[PDB]
Homo-oligomer: A and B are copies of this chain.
Amino acid sequence: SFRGKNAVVTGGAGGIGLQVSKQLLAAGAAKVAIIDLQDNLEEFVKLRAAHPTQSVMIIKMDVANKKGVEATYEEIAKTFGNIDIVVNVAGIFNDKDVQRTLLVNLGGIINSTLSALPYMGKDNGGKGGIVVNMSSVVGLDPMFIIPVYGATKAGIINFTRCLANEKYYQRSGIKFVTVCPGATMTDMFTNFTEKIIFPETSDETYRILDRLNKQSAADVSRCILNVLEKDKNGAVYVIEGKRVYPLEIKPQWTGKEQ
């Protein structure tokens, strides 16, 4: 299934990304590299032990750091020698810090995606592969409480769909997929109300926070592995209530000129 495959996962020390890393290994992935800010060291020790015939590599790196990411990917390629799968999950919610939100959520995805390509492409010696970028349902349909976060999520979609063009695919053999999950119980929502732009919308946060138990990080991760098996270039998937929904995206309809 994913046996013999080499994978990289940003945000792979926690939440959804952690479950992606775990499940990839449990699905028989040869090698798994984790790029994250947080150490979670005790957790990775036991993970190595549970997969003694599989490589588990952790690099502490901020995905916002372009050169850092570039360097990190270099280190991975020395060890791995090839990359088949990239899952870019890293992201934060903090609408009070615009610059950080933009650079992490949108720049991180881009930095990681672009840094991986030379080690994956059929041109430059690779065998091709797949990149899955973490967007959100709110990137598809704006959610008024969280405009800055949402903007970064919409950007990820546009970015990822672009790279899936036939022009690139024929040359690189790399596929590009976006996933858009709904509310999911993770540390991203810790102190959520403290981090929203408009304090007078604190009484509307229930709209998100009451739905967190409707799917888990593990559930979302299972849907992601499902998305990987489909291996369909340019696809966009919604992940809601533990299920995967393929989107057929149609261009916007235009009214008569005013």
A120 to B238 Cα, complex, angstroms: 37
Residues of B within 8 A of A200 (CB): 171
A162 touches B142 (CB 8 A): yes
Q: Tell me whether A252 and B257 are in contact (CB under 8 A).
A: no
Whether the Cβ atoms of A159 and B150 lie closer than 8 Å is: yes
CB-based contact B98/A141 at 8 Å: no
State whether the Cβ of A185 lies closer than 8 Å to any Cβ in chain B.
no
24 chain-A/chain-B pairs, Cβ below 8 angstroms: A98-B107, A98-B111, A102-B103, A110-B148, A138-B158, A140-B253, A141-B251, A146-B162, A147-B159, A147-B163, A148-B159, A151-B158, A153-B158, A154-B157, A168-B198, A171-B200, A180-B253, A230-B258, A238-B252, A245-B255, A245-B258, A247-B253, A248-B255, A248-B257
Residues of chain A touching chain B, judged by Cβ–Cβ distance below 8 Å, are: 66, 98-99, 102-103, 106-107, 110-111, 114, 137-148, 150-159, 161-165, 167-168, 171, 180, 197-198, 200-201, 204, 226, 230, 238, 240, 243-258
Those 3 A-B pairs whose CB atoms lie nearest each other, nearest first: A151-B155, A144-B165, A147-B162
